[PDB]
Amino acid sequence: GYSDRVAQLTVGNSTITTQEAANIVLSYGEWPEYCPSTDATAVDKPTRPDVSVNRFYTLSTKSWKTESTGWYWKFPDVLNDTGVFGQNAQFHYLYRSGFCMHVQCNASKFHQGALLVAAIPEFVIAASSPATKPNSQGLYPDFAHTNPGKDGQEFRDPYVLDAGIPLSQALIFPHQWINLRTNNCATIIMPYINALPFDSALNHSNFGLVVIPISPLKYCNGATTEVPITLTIAPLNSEFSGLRQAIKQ
Amino acid sequence: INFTNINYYKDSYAASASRQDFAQDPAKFTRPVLDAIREAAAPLQ
Amino acid sequence: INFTNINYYKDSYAASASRQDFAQDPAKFTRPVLDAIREAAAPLQ
Amino acid sequence: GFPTELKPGTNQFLTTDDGTSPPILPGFEPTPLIHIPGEFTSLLDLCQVETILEVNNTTGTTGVSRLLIPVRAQNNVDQLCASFQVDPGRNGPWQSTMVGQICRYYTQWSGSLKVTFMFTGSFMATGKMLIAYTPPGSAQPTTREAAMLGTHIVWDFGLQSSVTLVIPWISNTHFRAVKTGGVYDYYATGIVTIWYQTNFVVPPDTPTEANIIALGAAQKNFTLKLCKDTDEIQQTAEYQ
Amino acid sequence: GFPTELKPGTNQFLTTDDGTSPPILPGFEPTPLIHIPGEFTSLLDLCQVETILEVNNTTGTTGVSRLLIPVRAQNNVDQLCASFQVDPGRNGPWQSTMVGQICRYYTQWSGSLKVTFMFTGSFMATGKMLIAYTPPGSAQPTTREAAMLGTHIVWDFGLQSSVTLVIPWISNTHFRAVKTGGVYDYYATGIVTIWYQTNFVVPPDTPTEANIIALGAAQKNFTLKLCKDTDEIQQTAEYQ
Amino acid sequence: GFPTELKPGTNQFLTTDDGTSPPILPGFEPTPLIHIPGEFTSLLDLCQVETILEVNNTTGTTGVSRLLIPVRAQNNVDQLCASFQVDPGRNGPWQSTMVGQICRYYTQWSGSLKVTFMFTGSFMATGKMLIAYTPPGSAQPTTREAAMLGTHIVWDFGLQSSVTLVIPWISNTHFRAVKTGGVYDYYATGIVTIWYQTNFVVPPDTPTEANIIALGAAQKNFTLKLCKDTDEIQQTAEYQ
Amino acid sequence: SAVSALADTTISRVTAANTAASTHSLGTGRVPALQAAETGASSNSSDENLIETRCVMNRNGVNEASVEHFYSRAGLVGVVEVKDSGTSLDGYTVWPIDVMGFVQQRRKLELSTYMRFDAEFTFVSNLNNSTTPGMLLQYMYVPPGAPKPDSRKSYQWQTATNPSVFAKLSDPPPQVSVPFMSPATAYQWFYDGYPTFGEHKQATNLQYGQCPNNMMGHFAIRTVSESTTGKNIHVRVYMRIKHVRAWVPRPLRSQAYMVKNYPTYSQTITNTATDRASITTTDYEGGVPASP
Amino acid sequence: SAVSALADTTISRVTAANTAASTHSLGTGRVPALQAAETGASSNSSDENLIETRCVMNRNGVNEASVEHFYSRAGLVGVVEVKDSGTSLDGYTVWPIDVMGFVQQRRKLELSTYMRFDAEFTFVSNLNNSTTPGMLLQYMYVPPGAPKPDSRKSYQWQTATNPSVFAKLSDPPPQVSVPFMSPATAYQWFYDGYPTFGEHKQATNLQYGQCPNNMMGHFAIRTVSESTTGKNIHVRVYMRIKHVRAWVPRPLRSQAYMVKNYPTYSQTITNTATDRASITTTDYEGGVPASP
Amino acid sequence: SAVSALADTTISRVTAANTAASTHSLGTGRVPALQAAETGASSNSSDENLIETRCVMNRNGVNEASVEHFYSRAGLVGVVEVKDSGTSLDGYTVWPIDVMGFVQQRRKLELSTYMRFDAEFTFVSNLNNSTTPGMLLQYMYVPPGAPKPDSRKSYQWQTATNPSVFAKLSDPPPQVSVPFMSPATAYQWFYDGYPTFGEHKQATNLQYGQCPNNMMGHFAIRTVSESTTGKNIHVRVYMRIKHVRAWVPRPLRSQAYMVKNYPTYSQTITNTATDRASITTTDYEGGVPASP
Ligand SMILES: CCCCCCCCCCCCCCCCCC(=O)O
Ligand SMILES: CCCCCCCCCCCCCCCCCC(=O)O
Ligand SMILES: CCCCCCCCCCCCCCCCCC(=O)O
Ligand SMILES: CCCCCCCCCCCCCC(=O)O
Ligand SMILES: CCCCCCCCCCCCCC(=O)O
């Protein structure tokens, strides 16, 4: 009737071991599933390259600092140029997949801090601008902020999630904390959420992956200053339809 | 004697609001975890 | 042939007045005493 | 012609009238309904999700720092860490909560609340806190001795990093008005004060000031009533 | 379109029309109904409660003294103590009664009345009174010999301190109009006169003047009809 | 008079309201319904009829020549014969089709399309063509090597003079908006390019340039939605 | 089927108490006339036991004296002037919902201490000259806590959640059903207490008797207009109390009211009964006596 | 027959969770208070397991907090001025159908990511002086792709296929039922993507977040007139969302909106919670303590 | 009873054709792609037999593409000006009933050669300033042969047998059901012939294509007036075609119409398809190719 602190996540040829894990958040209680015949609309037979694309891709490592605001990734965009997933995402017009997001941040028992690892469906990034005409560039975020790639994007205003919504209510989304005294990893299994059965992996980013320090990383002199935060994600039940020439963006 | 929830048009979307199917399933937002944790139990043991 | 007391709305408080339950219980105001006193009897004996 | 008599309320447009209206599109079959994960059918299900209380809503405190209750090693005993009123719809820490924002779309609320405090210090940081809920009629307790007379929990920091303080539904009325202030302090819910039961003890070479994150939510018996319009965002011109 | 024809009375707002109207709050469940003691469902139940008749409604008499019928030791015999008309809605002693005020919310009344006289003298004060109800057609009896020809009770003061004089429903019509005066004396109920059957005898060192308290109410066969607006309080400006 | 309350939408004339109206002619029996051949009860049945695509909609090309895809003997290999977008309601070759004109009376379409190419050269003219459907996201393929990565058919000229290229319903949404251009290229269907798989080989004394006639239609799973008004013919004055 | 319910929908007549025939009683120990009013109980003496009565099969209907029939009558509860002319170019008015502003409704309600009821609110709006030109009004119910409008154009009139009625003056009176809206089990016309804790040592003491369980918000009325209309609209609010549950009957008010939310009578106390010349003088002349 | 269906049409009351009676607990291993918020799960601690509770048979109705009741309320979604006076002698206006132009409706919708619903659109049209003279209007729905009118006389008003409503200003507000019109399974108030492929390197980047699955065409309104009427008509569009299906709840918007189709907040970020003097200061005075 | 009929009155959804799952085919003699368009038959090639398809349980509703739903929409069929001002002080107008005067209705009808239908004719009448003052109009149907009125007072308005509708402009639009009135089994939008025998050698040849089976008389409209009203009334006639039976589908008209009763196109023939630069140029930019 409890959650075991040890966990092993084996997907494909990738395996993730954690010895200080809180639990595994199954987003909205729904495992990732393949598109049923009732919900499908595209007639082409989808490709399900099970083990070549459904596997853990360690994508980015961000150095947690005392004044760090946080980072966000867009799930399809963060894997669109990586591995056989990226190739299928480029060669195919349609794509659907869940994911198993695994954020890793280990620190000594003398460090402190708390990250909020949340998976935000349809994470539309806002721009912070003064009162200006709709002609103004500052009213709308550039592409580097909407699709940060694999490197992610440092939050400008994590208090409002760079979306005008309060960070305090970001816990309405499938979330997990990395409290350094408690756990060093946060696992979120997110099913494919979209008003469409399939969608373009290049145009549309289904989920945002926010890692925001709520309690700032504090430690004493002599502790290891560099405390990294690693994002390992794994597609789950990846389908691809609409084969054509490979399209980058 | 109630005489309501009557559709006068052949299109079903012309009907009144569907106000008779109150369902409350908060577990998908409140306990979205794989390991079900008992209340009396220490969660991380 | 009466066709009334019909609620046309899903909310029960939109109905007409409840005018069919005339009840008269004056004893709680007229004889609010512990010792029931017969009419023919001298009350304080 | 069937004899009819038009009654008052004829020709009125009540914005909350669940009635029929002619369909603009004869024979329109919409796009099929596919399964989308995360359907919510009740706003009470959303109110039970714990969201961060903005307890450090003080002048100077900016950004995510407003979500932290600072806890440090005390030089004296029986001291006050933080306090906040537990009126969900009152301008204050509960504004940052999903329950405190959905409450504002309703006039009256009812049911128990729940604040889960998460300690975000070092593993080596130990401490015991007394988190007391003071029912109405009393101001914020001036001493821990006065606060421990109300509904309280003595929280011990440890492997489990979070404690839940249920604010029980202690009310004279079945519902409390979401509006507060003035004569509406009749519907005051109370005050939650966090006291140092013991100190915040740390070994050497360990941070001496940590943070408690408060997570407010609604209990299973929570209920809202009389949907109204919130007073959270105002508009002076149509968004173009 | 179903053929209909609008009839007269269309668009009118009748203030006494028990009809339906659209609910402003969809799905509103009110606060639960808990048991409150003292529910009254009929105004006739209130009219049967005995309330003090203001029989001493005379010039100079102020305050609670207007509720007392003075009785004293008489130097002569067969004297008149007090008289009052038994028209419930007439400006007079019955205004101070619950029956006389609920009667004014109705146009026509019917049924027997009841005046319970309570003697509030010393235990040593003895006396016999003749309380006579004179049916309509006769003025106030000038002598006790004339009053004893009507419905009367000879009241003996004693351990039981109260007597009940039923004013029987002696009327030509099934109902009497609450309005009195002018041609509406057709609906006169009668006159109740209190006479000294014997004297008011007291021993030495005992008060020689006591008070009778009249308590008017309605009998079980009392009935009201044609709800109207009372003429008891007038308003010249909205109460701000 | 039966109590009724008029609701919003009273007295409005909705042009798409299937309601009753009084008959102008009592007891009118129309002319008997005799069998007429060629009754159509569904516009989808009309959309499945193959009609000539106007693929040669180029400047200078006039008349029936706009319905021909010229094919000739090539001096080089892997060359492009013709290309056209497969958006049925887009201004282009599909305007000349019954499916492309009935699509314009609807806002959203769905289902597979079908282009039957008929080779109208000499019996002695042989050739193989690669007709490729490029799903959205890609521009017109610049080489046959890039086009053969999509849905394609290698057509061999012979006794059967016609090939069918199904444009499969490869869409993210269940329906595509008939409107194209701008942000509505989100509903782009793709591009069909005709490539010379091999050459157009003829014996001596034989025409070296022939024509392919494209015949566009809708597959059995074709569906239209949200009837609207087409933008094909405009009127500035009532036709007198 | 349910046609049996529609058949028994007319009001059935409940008759008054029949009078039984009674004869003379000559004995001891049986004293139905002697009572003890000190016991707090009304007299149980019947007409049969004090006079020789006849058999009266009474058929007088007592059904009209019910609390429902006494209260289910639309009376004036509010007059809201939508001033849009002269010095007050507002075009809107936010009216505190209170049913104790007019004597006829107030005195009937104060017959009971607690009343739990639904209401049928009707709005009879017109100009000063009694005319009702087609002029679009918006009657928005602003529950306690909802933002009150501060102009005729303010965002609160979007009424995304607030109940609102749009009706022209030319339309028949807007009529809506209001539920029992109260945090308490019943409304409370008399609240012997204070809403808040404290010392209550103010010179005015305005908070005595003020129960917020009865304060049900505001009625915001506006002309749906873009500028001043130059016309003042008088909205008369009529409340018909239905589904009534009354508790703890009270003496009907005898003194003239002076304020809305407080029992407060003048120092010149008016007697409940009108004065007469003497305690032995009745002004009923009757007929000519046969033999004086 | 089907009279059983008409009987069970009133809304039944679903009550809140009852509180069970609980006693004291003195032992080890049973820690219903200790939680682990890192797990992403809300606390399963009940009131019975943290305090000694009583048996409360709760009868509070939770039925009003449903997504249907929260959304089935007509709010303002559009104000369309049919300018026909002064410099704008058009007599018609083609209005882009968007429900995100007004804060009250927009903030309620953005509580959810995806919403699939039918709507009841109501048109409350009047002049500037709130008056509604008999003036024939035509409210034509122009779906995406249908030709938009370019004058008050143009051929598009023939509405042979377009839905159109003819109603005078004097008529009660025109009200129609609109189905779920969208190529997607649900509307999408937040679209983290771009409608078209490409580089998206523009200085403005206007296409981010613009999902054409929500762009449902235009509402073309005209006075059915032959020349200028000299009167501007203000059409207020009210949408009542019925048959609601909401997915992926979101944080309610905290910053003031700046534009219609983009989340864009000011550089002056407003705190979700109002500032107080100190983290240990609460402004609740309560009563006088018995013994301080 | 007949309550079963009222239950099955809502439109049931007929779905599109499902796609079956298909695998690869490597053999001879099975050529589902090769067709012979010379046979006049459309291709019977299915998606399953040309590509590897999946199983798509299609739930797209094809019910809206029916001839009933395509035609049962009120479109403008006539604009009748009742001139009563200036040089035309007639107060009446006799309008030849023809549904081919306006492009939107005409092009939809000419999709079919023969149409047998009942109609719901609606009359939306108003003044030039779009206002609808209470003004009594008489819409009299004058069938072929009935005497046409020659004034506003003439005897034909007695309408002892002619169908006539009296309705003020202030009333909602008069709406009547017209049966299938035709000597033929169906109306005939294209009549390749002449109504009368003869030589047909006129220089104009006005009688070609004129089938009197479609000429259904006149609509005589008058103001019920005794003198000139000084106001011109514009009556817009809207026909909703119901109970439709269509035969012999035709190509939709591509050239702009020039006259009412004749197919007649300009010498400047407009191409059905818009011109592009080349037969190998498509204006779809797509995305950036991964490796060109
Ligand atoms: C759309 C307009 C709707 C109108 C809403 C009316 C709401 C009325 C509230 C119910 C009235 C009864 C409670 C009044 C109690 C106040 C009296 C008092 O104690 O001072
Ligand atoms: C005759 C007049 C009929 C009115 C037709 C109204 C059609 C309304 C469309 C449905 C509204 C909901 C979808 C709105 C989504 C747009 C918001 C956005 O994402 O910017
Ligand atoms: C009281 C007013 C009643 C209106 C009577 C309308 C009668 C309409 C006739 C039916 C319309 C369809 C037939 C039109 C055919 C004419 C077109 C043509 O071939 O030129
Ligand atoms: C026109 C007649 C419509 C009849 C509709 C059915 C109403 C049944 C009456 C009982 C109400 C249901 C709740 C109950 O059982 O008490
Ligand atoms: C539309 C039909 C409604 C029928 C309602 C039931 C009426 C029954 C008729 C008898 C009236 C009841 C009193 C009686 O039994 O005489």
Side-chain angles (χ1 to χ4, degrees), chain E residues 174-175, chain G residues 14-18 56 58-62:
Chain E
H174 283 249
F175 288 79
Chain G
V14 275
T15 60
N18 304 340
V56 179
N58 199 336
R59 289 181 286 124
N60 296 345
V62 302

Side-chain angles (χ1 to χ4, degrees), chain C residues 13-19 22-23 26-41:
Chain C
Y13 64 90
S16 55
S18 301
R19 299 191 289 147
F22 181 85
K28 71 210 306 176
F29 311 111
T30 59
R31 312 290 297 182
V33 297
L34 275 183
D35 302 332
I37 305 176
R38 294 180 182 179
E39 175 178 355

Side-chain angles (χ1 to χ4, degrees), chain A residues 121-122 141 146 156 205 249, chain H residues 114 192 194 199 205 250 265 272:
Chain A
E122 307 289 342
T146 66
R156 170 197 59 251
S205 297
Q249 182 192 346
Chain H
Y114 312 104
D192 185 13
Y194 297 82
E199 287 173 356
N205 196 23
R250 305 182 69 92
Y265 53 95
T272 315

Side-chain angles (χ1 to χ4, degrees), chain A residues 35-37 40 42-43 46 198 239, chain I residues 19-21 52-56:
Chain A
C35 186
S37 301
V43 300
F198 288 73
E239 303 187 44
Chain I
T19 301
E52 283 187 11
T53 52
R54 62 166 300 170
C55 183
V56 179

Side-chain angles (χ1 to χ4, degrees), chain G residues 1-3 5-7 9 11 14-56 58-80 82-97 99-119 121-218 220-226 228-292:
Chain G
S1 301
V3 297
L6 299 179
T9 41
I11 295 182
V14 275
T15 60
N18 304 340
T19 301
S22 59
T23 182
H24 57 77
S25 178
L26 295 178
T28 59
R30 197 190 82 89
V31 277
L34 292 179
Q35 300 289 334
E38 291 97 1
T39 66
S42 299
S43 174
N44 50 10
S45 302
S46 56
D47 314 322
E48 300 87 17
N49 291 322
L50 299 195
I51 65 158
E52 283 187 11
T53 52
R54 62 166 300 170
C55 183
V56 179
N58 199 336
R59 289 181 286 124
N60 296 345
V62 302
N63 178 84
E64 201 177 3
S66 61
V67 162
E68 196 71 25
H69 294 110
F70 177 76
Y71 282 111
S72 182
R73 299 170 181 272
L76 184 63
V77 294
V79 178
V80 201
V82 191
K83 302 179 180 180
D84 205 354
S85 63
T87 66
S88 181
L89 302 180
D90 301 333
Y92 84 104
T93 162
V94 186
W95 173 72
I97 296 183
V99 299
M100 296 315 203
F102 300 91
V103 64
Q104 286 195 347
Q105 196 71 267
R106 176 169 180 184
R107 190 172 187 267
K108 296 214 308 176
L109 297 191
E110 293 185 355
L111 173 68
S112 37
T113 307
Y114 312 104
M115 276 180 59
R116 173 191 182 100
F117 56 83
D118 309 319
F121 272 76
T122 313
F123 308 98
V124 201
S125 313
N126 60 276
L127 297 187
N128 296 88
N129 55 7
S130 67
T131 56
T132 59
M135 285 181 62
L136 192 67
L137 288 186
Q138 181 180 3
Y139 312 85
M140 185 176 59
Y141 173 43
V142 185
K148 308 175 194 177
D150 38 9
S151 67
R152 83 182 76 207
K153 316 178 182 181
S154 63
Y155 78 96
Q156 298 85 324
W157 301 107
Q158 297 169 16
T159 177
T161 315
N162 283 342
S164 171
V165 172
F166 291 83
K168 326 177 202 305
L169 295 178
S170 60
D171 294 332
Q175 190 172 272
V176 292
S177 289
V178 175
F180 170 71
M181 312 178 313
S182 180
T185 298
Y187 299 115
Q188 203 160 172
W189 314 129
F190 297 88
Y191 175 65
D192 185 13
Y194 297 82
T196 68
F197 297 80
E199 287 173 356
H200 311 300
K201 63 174 188 180
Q202 309 291 158
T204 46
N205 196 23
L206 294 173
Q207 289 189 6
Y208 177 60
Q210 305 315 302
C211 184
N213 294 335
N214 304 323
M215 310 194 306
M216 291 327 294
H218 295 64
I221 307 174
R222 69 152 176 177
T223 67
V224 186
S225 179
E226 301 293 333
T228 170
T229 61
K231 300 174 175 55
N232 296 344
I233 297 182
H234 286 263
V235 182
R236 289 171 180 79
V237 188
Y238 290 82
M239 178 187 61
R240 183 177 69 95
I241 284 185
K242 53 184 183 177
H243 311 151
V244 203
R245 297 286 289 263
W247 291 276
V248 189
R250 305 182 69 92
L252 286 174
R253 175 90 174 195
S254 61
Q255 308 298 304
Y257 298 109
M258 302 214 308
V259 288
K260 188 208 305 300
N261 300 281
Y262 308 87
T264 304
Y265 53 95
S266 299
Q267 296 198 0
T268 305
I269 296 183
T270 63
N271 305 127
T272 315
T274 318
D275 298 0
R276 55 176 174 164
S278 174
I279 203 179
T280 56
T281 56
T282 55
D283 46 354
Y284 178 58
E285 304 168 335
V288 182
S291 182

Side-chain angles (χ1 to χ4, degrees), chain H residues 56 58-80 82-97 99-119 121-128:
Chain H
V56 179
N58 199 336
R59 289 181 286 124
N60 296 345
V62 302
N63 178 84
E64 201 177 3
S66 61
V67 162
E68 196 71 25
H69 294 110
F70 177 76
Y71 282 111
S72 182
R73 299 170 181 272
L76 184 63
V77 294
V79 178
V80 201
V82 191
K83 302 179 180 180
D84 205 354
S85 63
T87 66
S88 181
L89 302 180
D90 301 333
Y92 84 104
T93 162
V94 186
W95 173 72
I97 296 184
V99 299
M100 296 315 203
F102 300 91
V103 64
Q104 286 195 347
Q105 196 71 267
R106 176 169 180 184
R107 190 172 187 267
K108 296 214 308 176
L109 297 191
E110 293 185 355
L111 173 68
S112 37
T113 307
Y114 312 104
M115 276 180 59
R116 173 191 182 100
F117 56 83
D118 309 319
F121 272 76
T122 313
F123 308 98
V124 201
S125 313
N126 60 276
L127 297 188
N128 296 88

